[PDB]
Every structure is written in C-alpha cells, then in structure tokens.
Write a protein that binds this ligand. Structure first.
Ligand SMILES: *[C@@H]1O[C@H](CO)[C@@H](O[C@@H]2O[C@H](CO)[C@@H](O)[C@H](O)[C@H]2NC(C)=O)[C@H](O)[C@H]1NC(C)=O
Ligand SMILES: *[C@@H]1O[C@H](CO)[C@@H](O)[C@H](O)[C@H]1NC(C)=O
Ligand SMILES: *[C@@H]1O[C@H](CO)[C@@H](O)[C@H](O)[C@H]1NC(C)=O
Ligand SMILES: *[C@@H]1O[C@H](CO)[C@@H](O)[C@H](O)[C@H]1NC(C)=O
Lengths: 49, 49, 265
C-alpha cells in the first residue's frame, strides 16, 4: 500500500536509474511496476504472482 | 453586530466572466455605457466597490 | 532608483529557422524503450523564431505574451538578471518579477515597487560593477514570495566563442506557471544560426499563483560608457499540437516528431 497504491506481488531491487523528479514506472499495459520507497531511497521492482 | 456590520467589502460590477483562479484587486471604475466617466457617480459612473 | 536609456537604435529583429529545440518531458513519470504519442503545447519544427542581438546601444523592447514563451540564450557575460512578466502598467496592477543574479533565485508576485527602466544607471565606463541594488521603488500591496537556490550562472566571460547556451520554456495553464530548463556546457562553434541537434528539456519549477499575463520584458543591466560586447538570444511562441516521442533504454527522450507538420510526419 504505497500512498494509496494497493497491489499484490513480489518486490525486488531495481537496477534502473530514475530522476529526482521521477517517482513511478509504467509499461505497455500502463500499470505501475517500478516504484520508489518514500523512506529509503532505493528503487523497487514489482512483479505479479 | 448588534448595530450592523460594514467592514467587509465586495463588488458586483464586473463586465465579463473571469477565468477560473483569477485575482482582481484593482478598483477600475465600473462603466455601464460608452460615455467615459470617473470619480463621482451618475449616469455610467457607478462605483464598483 | 532607475535611469532610462534614451536614443534607442533598435536593430531589425532577425529570423531563424528553429530546427528541433523545444521538446520537454510532459510528466514526471518513467518509461523505457517505448514509443509514445502525446497531445501537448509545443513549438513546431522549422519556425522563424525571433533573434535579438545586443552589441552605448541597448535594445530590449517589451514584447507581448501569448501561450508560453520559448527563450534561448547563448552567452558568457551574465548580464541577464531575470524577467518582467505580466500587465504591469507602472505596477499598479498585478505582476511578477524574477531576480537570479548571484545569491539566490527569488520570484516575487506583487503590485510592485517599480522603476521606469529595467537597468539602473546603467554602468560606469570600463567595468561592469553593480550598484544601486534596489530595482524597485514603491508599492501598494504584495501577494507572493519565493526564494530558492541560485542556478548555474557563471559571472563574466570572453567576447565570442560562447559556451553558455541555456534554453528555458515558460508555460501558463490555469495558474500553473511551469518553467523548464536545460543548459548545455560547451559549444566550440562561433555564434550563428547554425546550432541544430538533439536535446531534452528537464522540468525545473512550478508556480501555483494564478495571475494574468499579457506581455513580458527581459532584465539586463549614473554615467554612460561601456566597451561593447556580444550577446545573442532568441524568443518564440507555442501552440497546441501532438508529438510522437521515442524513448531509450536509460529512460530519456531521444527523438520527437510532429504530426501535423508534414505529410511524412
Ligand atoms: C487577462 O489578460 C488579457 C490579455 O491576455 C486582458 O484582456 C483584456 O480584456 C478586456 C475586456 O474587454 C479588453 O478591454 C482589454 O483591451 C484586454 N487587454 C488587452 C491588452 O487587450 C485582461 O487583462 C484579462 N482578461 C480577462 C478576461 O480577465
Ligand atoms: C525616466 O522616465 C520617467 C518617465 O516618466 C521619468 O518619470 C523619470 O524621471 C526618468 N528618469 C530619469 C533618470 O531620467
Ligand atoms: C518567416 O520569417 C519572416 C521574416 O520576416 C516572417 O515575416 C514570417 O512571418 C516568418 N514565417 C513564419 C511562419 O514564422
Ligand atoms: C561609476 O560611477 C558611479 C556613479 O555614477 C559610481 O558609483 C561608481 O563607483 C563608478 N565606478 C567606477 C569604476 O568608476
């Protein structure tokens, strides 16, 4: 539950590089799969079951 | 108040519909006709405030 | 206190075919190696953008504002100190002013303290020392203040072989005043109409103040004497179109193409 983003899946460490203004990450399906944890500033990767 | 209140001010004399989130503070004299007028009230001289 | 210019020898405004500049990130999201199509306000390719060249002689007239402004400057001298925007009328109406000279970037929105001229004296004969720091005299009432960290403005530079090319775009939408910035470090080429290539405009700042703007003028700096330098800048407008953008593996904008420009487009 990331700021209202209620989802289910597995969370890995994402190696891609974002920008200071960037906060999310989409795909062809336009569903969020790469997120930024507000407290610790690494990048998480979301993969469904 | 018990004797009435007069501190709060407004204006209902504007020419056209303002766009959303537009601020107007200036006290340009309201006109009702093509005759130019300012200051004292009268025909086409009504104060906006 | 401010002192007027007089004896205005205005150069004819030159015209340059703007090749590919003006593409910016539409929103603060991330994509990766995917094409996209977006309807947005833009400056089209191959438009006759207005070129102003500044060489005793100062030329900076007031220009009308319509649907954002794409501004570019190729310089080294750091003469620019901000921008005057709005519907001022000797600041008895609401406007906003920008000062970003050395210490901080300050944006004020007010029924301002005002001058009768952008600069101050202007300068003494040889050097470009700054004095009479007050660029504003007397007001009625103010609305908004903003203070932030100063931008990368290197002070003073050589005449010719300019490297400081900074492109800003100014957008107004229903009180959202969004300024996007991009500075490129080095251009070994001499200042001409030549520069063309690929670039991206990272977003810089947003202001939710909600005012009305109809015209704008720049801000550049008691005796009358100066050894003339070189300054080159460009101003252009925008209109709503739709663009096709190609992303990359890293997540940056590589190429953009118009849709209503050419039949091939
Ligand atoms: C917001 O700014 C516009 C300019 O973009 C101004 O339009 C004025 O509208 C009145 C309406 O009759 C005209 O009499 C003026 O001549 C217009 N100004 C100019 C410079 O032409 C005005 O300041 C604002 N408009 C609205 C609708 O709020
Ligand atoms: C500049 O011009 C304005 C125009 O009204 C005038 O009021 C002001 O005194 C002038 N200043 C100087 C220094 O000439
Ligand atoms: C092209 O530049 C000329 C030079 O004066 C100008 O008159 C004309 O309006 C410009 N056309 C466009 C489409 O910008
Ligand atoms: C130039 O003249 C101004 C007064 O108009 C003075 O304040 C300033 O110190 C002078 N600067 C130089 C370098 O002579």
């Amino acid at each position: 539950n990331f700021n209202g983003l209620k989802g289910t899946g597995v969370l890995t460490e994402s190696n891609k590089k974002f920008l200071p203004f960037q906060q999310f990450g989409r795909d062809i399906a336009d569903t969020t799969d790469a997120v930024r944890d507000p407290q610790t500033l690494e990048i998480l990767d979301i993969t469904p079951c | 108040k018990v004797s009435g209140n007069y501190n709060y001010l407004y204006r209902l004399f504007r020419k056209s519909n303002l766009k959303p989130f537009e601020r107007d503070i200036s006290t340009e004299i309201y006109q009702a006709g093509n005759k130019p007028c300012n200051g004292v009230a009268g025909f086409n001289c009504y104060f906006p405030l | 206190q401010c002192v007027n210019l007089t004896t205005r020898t205005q150069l004819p405004p030159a015209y340059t075919n703007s090749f590919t500049r003006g593409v910016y990130y539409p929103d603060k999201v991330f994509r990766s190696s995917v094409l996209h199509s977006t309807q947005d306000l833009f400056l089209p390719f191959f438009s006759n953008v207005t070129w102003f060249h500044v060489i005793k002689r100062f030329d900076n007239p007031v220009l009308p504002f319509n649907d954002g402004v794409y501004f570019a400057s190729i310089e080294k001298s750091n003469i620019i100190r901000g921008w005057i925007f709005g519907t001022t009328l000797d600041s008895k109406t609401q406007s906003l002013l920008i000062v970003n000279n050395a210490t901080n970037v300050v944006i004020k929105v007010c029924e301002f303290q005002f001058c009768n001229d952008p600069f101050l004296d202007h300068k003494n004969n040889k050097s470009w020392m700054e004095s009479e720091f007050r660029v504003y005299s007397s007001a009625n009432n103010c609305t908004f203040e903003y203070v932030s960290q100063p931008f990368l403005m290197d002070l003073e530079g050589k005449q010719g072989n300019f490297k400081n090319l900074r492109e800003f775009v100014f957008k107004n939408i229903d009180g959202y005043f969004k300024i996007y910035s991009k500075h490129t470090p080095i251009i070994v080429r001499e200042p001409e109409d030549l520069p063309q290539g690929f670039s991206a405009l990272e977003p810089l700042v947003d202001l939710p103040i909600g005012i009305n703007i109809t015209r704008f003028q720049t801000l550049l700096a008691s005796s009358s004497g100066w050894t003339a330098g070189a300054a080159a800048y460009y101003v252009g407008y925008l209109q709503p179109r739709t663009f096709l953008l190609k992303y990359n593996e890293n997540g940056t904008i590589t190429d953009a193409v118009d849709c209503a420009l050419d039949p091939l487009s």
